[PDB]
């Protein structure tokens, strides 16, 4: 049964077609398909100021993109040699262990969600919007956050951003703990 | 307790394959047989009875000769697999439970117990194998539906499902009518003898020995319980052993050719039918049963999947002791003196005299004349020129049944007047 | 008496189409349609002659369903890899 | 046992439920844009074959349900038993508990053989 | 037929039509994750009558182009569209659909607009989950028959009536 | 009775028509399930109640649900395909097709009878004790086989 | 039907009407009542919307059910992809007139039932295969093989459990004698709640409707994120409306059908009244069955079907061969309660290792 699983169905997330090559229940193999979104970040970043490409940055994986603007903010520097401040660089781990944990909340609820029950989606993507409500506390924004420079940061963190923080420090260890 | 330690056995054997090796579960197939063998030597003149379940000299002979029709074709199978055997002793209890009872539905649900796992033995994988089988499957089927009807306007003839019941006219005719439809299909009978050749020659060689002996001799068992009219049985007979020989002589191949000739041989049987004798029946089958049993080890140690006429030929040169064996096959399903195929033919003519049949009789006999054709070009090729020949001689095992098998033929047929005198209550 | 000449009817319609059907398993069909019209004759010779042909067909759709299990085992093992399943195809063994 | 008032009453059930059924089915056929178009009447999953062209299913639906026509065929003997039991006796019970452990047989068989093919 | 001819009852149809809008999932981008908490446990798009979610094509009316519509996936959107029920609505979610966005190239359809008929669409990058909820109450009342423009012309109810689709 | 004993036995003998004549293997085995319902009910109308039960739950729920698993399997529907049509076979076996009925009627034609017995119903709390009694030992054998169709069919296609 | 009474014609014609529109009704509310308690399980509540209490959202959705472009794929079969569900649905409501919900009268007059039938576990049965053959009817009807693996995952799967079902069934006969579930309630009310006989087979039974569309083989199987299942994928307007109907009408047979038979199906110690008890034990298998599905996983279809084979069978027919041993005994009544009891301790000791 060379079975088409095609682009986004049956609600495969990330779009995707899989020609199953398949007798019956079994899956000989399967005979990937990508290119459904391929959108040319490659090509349409060479033609933005080094300062706009930070906002080409975090688009495209959109789960952990702190990674992404880290690793560029990191490799212009060394171009150039620029030095980031420690409180500023304490700041980019910060968020970078904070999207890691937004990350992996989505990755999980998508993964039980995808065969087997709901429910567990939203425990965890709900304190994604915690999370989120901290990032929109200091970026003004859910994701896509266009904070980093190649210097360091765009600018400070307010008095409001600390205690939202540590108030999820506080509940995110018992909330694992529970799906373990 | 036969029936008892047949599915006693044939029930612990099924998981025990599990933990045996499929050489112990041979040998444990040939004790329970060789149980049920001695255990019916025992109660010889022993009618034993639980409810419709009743066993008598008719159930006692025929299943008899069916346990030596199993015992032989087990002997030649050594195939890996247990199930090659267990269905072996499934459908042999099924022939017992065909003998055993009066009951027509009893009587069909042995007939698929006997019938479904010999379907399956059919498969050594050959491609003919299949197409055989599938013919045998459907024309089973299909004969199983006319029989089922049979039993089913038997019951509307009378208010029990047993054969003796006193029966009207013009229905007790068609149920009859019915129920030998399906009994003389199984019983290689004409018109419905067709599936015999296509089985004969596309099955593997022990498995046709077991068919041709045991099948036929517990549907003639069963048979014997039925009223069969004479003129139904003079259409049966008259056809059967005509087209049986006549298409007999065209046959270039071996098995297809003897399956025409127990067409014949089927024909000359149900001539104790007239009578309903079942003395000189048993003879007959236990005649026929041990000649075929001999000559298709014979052909198994040729070739299993098919066999020529010219495979037979120069068998004398490669085993003398066979081409022996099987000219005394040859000549007792001929039925001539001195061999005891010859005292059953002649019981079973005897019975058709008493019974006052003379046309169907005679014509009978001169086909009977004319399948010495056959019955030469087969046991006097025994000494010809061995030409392009399948031969891997077989067994001890085989051979030594075979010249037992011959040497009872013989024996029987010099002196009848030993077991004959034990073919009624047996004492 | 209605139900019995239906059961004579039945009969020879399923007989029609064993004769006739081509491939294996509408045969087959046929055939069930045949085995269960007998049965309706036995069901009414049981309502005249005291319940016991009851058990009898009951007895026989078991029989039907056994022989149902083993047949289509066995057209699946000949036509699984071959071709469509029409018997005329299979003409190797003649007389 | 039981009147034939009550069979009649069932067919009328049927009768209702078929009524209501072909009447809602004409409902919703009725009340509709109905523009199909030639892409609109394709089967699915983006151009052709969701699935297309495939090779036979697996057999293993087919074992499933002959094991299932043996079994219900055993659940249907098992019944009258179930009904009249203290006029069988010690002897309906040893009975039924022979064919019971027969057909049990045959469970343990195909079992350790197992079907997952 | 159509939902018409009659004053009531076109009233009831565009009314059960607005409130029982049945998503069909379509995520492209980035914009997906911010359409799905719209349904998160703070901020759902459960209540509406949009709890329910059937992935297939033939089951729901409401198309949320939720990401940048890459060109290889326009052609297979087109007849996924066709794949829909007649009565059917098409919400562009996201810049990358409504516009070419950022994404000024030759890899994105630069207003999808051209492929399928939009309903409604969404600025924003990614579209705040209650602005997804503002673009579907504003097709709301839309497919009410109840929404004008800034010239004066009111909608139709339902796009993708307009269109000779072949 | 006859007036809706009539109408059953023309649905009963349509849907033989039907089942022995439809190319469409789907529509052939569904049609011969609508006379097994039919039938059924005829078998209540007989008095026997639970052997229609089991009729239903058997053939139907059972049997040929794996003709149509088979079917849907190995498609096969429209068998017409590598004809090989023998033009006389179907005129020809249409008439053996009568005649097995004729002979049948010629039975049962002219023939009546005793059909008066109060069965109270083929309920299984009667049945019983025939179907486990008096038919014990054809149950019993039933069952073997039951098991011997089970093994051969498991060892016929076994694949190793 | 030994000591029951029975309606006039047009009173049956009247009562089966009542009961398919009330199903419809119930259904509908039951879809909104299962939604917003997933929401309570999911910390998301539900639709404070169209309602005040969303009890007007259902009108709305069948309303737009309607109008909804009820199409006839082409490609596909011109007369069964329409009919099967026609059969899904009408076999379906069915089967749920036996439940007694009174004594006789107590429907303000003629009857609480429907009709109550001599052999009735075996009409559930029987049109219990007929929602099967319906599912995966239309599975195959779609012309879609995609949407056809799934019909036939639904097809075994419900069959090997709908085997299970009879060897759970069983046992209990043997104790009534009958097949009338009226009896089998009455003895319900004489000796007491049938499952504390009968426990395990009472398991074998609920876990066999588990399997039964319910959930959590979950292999039932919807289309969603995994092989399509059957009886949806090609369907607009009204058919899958009938499709989905018809499930959870099975949904909520079964969910009546247990209290009835092993547990107290109404027949209450205390205050006795008809309607109220059966009704609350309904909701109240309602919210187990709800908790289970937004709570527990899928099972695959094959580790289900090999669980069914070898547990829960052989399990059912060995309580059976049990129950038959005290039964054709007759002695005690008691043997079966301390065996039961044991039973149940060791189904459940079991767990907390
Ligand atoms: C039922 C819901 C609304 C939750 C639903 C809606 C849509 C989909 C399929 S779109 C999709 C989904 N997740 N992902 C990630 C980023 C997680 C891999 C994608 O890349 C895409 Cl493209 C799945 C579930
Ligand atoms: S508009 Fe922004 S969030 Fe949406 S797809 Fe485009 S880049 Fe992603």
Redesign the interface.
Known sequence: ????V??????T?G?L?LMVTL???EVLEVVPHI??????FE??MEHRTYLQNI??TP?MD??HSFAHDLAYALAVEKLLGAVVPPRAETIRVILNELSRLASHL?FLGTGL???????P???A??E??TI?DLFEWVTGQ???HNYIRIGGVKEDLPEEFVPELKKLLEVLPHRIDEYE | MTLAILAVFSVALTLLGFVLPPQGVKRATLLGLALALASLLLTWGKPFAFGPYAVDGVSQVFTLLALLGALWTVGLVRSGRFEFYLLVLYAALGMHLLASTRHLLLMLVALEALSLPLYALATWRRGQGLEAALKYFLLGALAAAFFLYGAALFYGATGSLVLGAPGEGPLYALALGLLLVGLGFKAALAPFHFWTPDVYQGSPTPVVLFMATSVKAAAFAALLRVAAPPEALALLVALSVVVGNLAALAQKEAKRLLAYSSIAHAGYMALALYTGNAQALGFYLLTYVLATGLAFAVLSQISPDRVPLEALRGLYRKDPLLGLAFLVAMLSLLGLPPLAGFWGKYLAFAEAARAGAWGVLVLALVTSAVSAYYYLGLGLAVFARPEETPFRPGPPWARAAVVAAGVLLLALGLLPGLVLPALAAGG | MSYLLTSALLFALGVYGVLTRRTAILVFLSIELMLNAANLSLVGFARAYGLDGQVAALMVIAVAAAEVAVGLGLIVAIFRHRESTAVDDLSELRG | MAPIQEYVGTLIYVGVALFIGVAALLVGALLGPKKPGRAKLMPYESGNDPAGEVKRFPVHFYVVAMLFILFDVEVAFLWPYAVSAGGLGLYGFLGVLAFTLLLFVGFLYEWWKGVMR | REGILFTTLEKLVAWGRSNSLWPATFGLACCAIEMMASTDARNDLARFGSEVFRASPRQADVMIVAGRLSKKMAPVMRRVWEQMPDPKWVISMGACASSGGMFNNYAIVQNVDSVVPVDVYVPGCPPRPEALIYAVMQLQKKVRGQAYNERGERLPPVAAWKRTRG | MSLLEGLALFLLLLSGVLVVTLRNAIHAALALILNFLVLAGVYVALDARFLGFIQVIVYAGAIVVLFLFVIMLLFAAQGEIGFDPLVRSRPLAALLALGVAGILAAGLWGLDLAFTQDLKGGLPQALGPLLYGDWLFVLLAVGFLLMAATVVAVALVEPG | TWSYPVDPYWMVALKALLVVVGLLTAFAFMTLIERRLLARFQVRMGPNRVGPFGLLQPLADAIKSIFKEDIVVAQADRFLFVLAPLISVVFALLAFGLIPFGPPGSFFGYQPWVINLDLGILYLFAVSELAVYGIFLSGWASGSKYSLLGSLRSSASLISYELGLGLALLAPVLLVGSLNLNDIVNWQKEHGWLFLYAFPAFLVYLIASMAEAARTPFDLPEAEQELVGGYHTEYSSIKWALFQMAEYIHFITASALIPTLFLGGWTMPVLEVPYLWMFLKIAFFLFFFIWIRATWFRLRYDQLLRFGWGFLFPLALLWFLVTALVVALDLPRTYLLYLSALSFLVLLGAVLY
């Open positions: 049964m060379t079975l088409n095609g682009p986004q169905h049956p609600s997330h779009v077609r007798s019956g229940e290119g459904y979104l391929h959108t040319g090509k349409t906002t080409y688009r959109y789960l989505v969600l995808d065969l087997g029950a709901l429910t989606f939203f425990y993507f709900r994604r919007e989120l859910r994701f896509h």
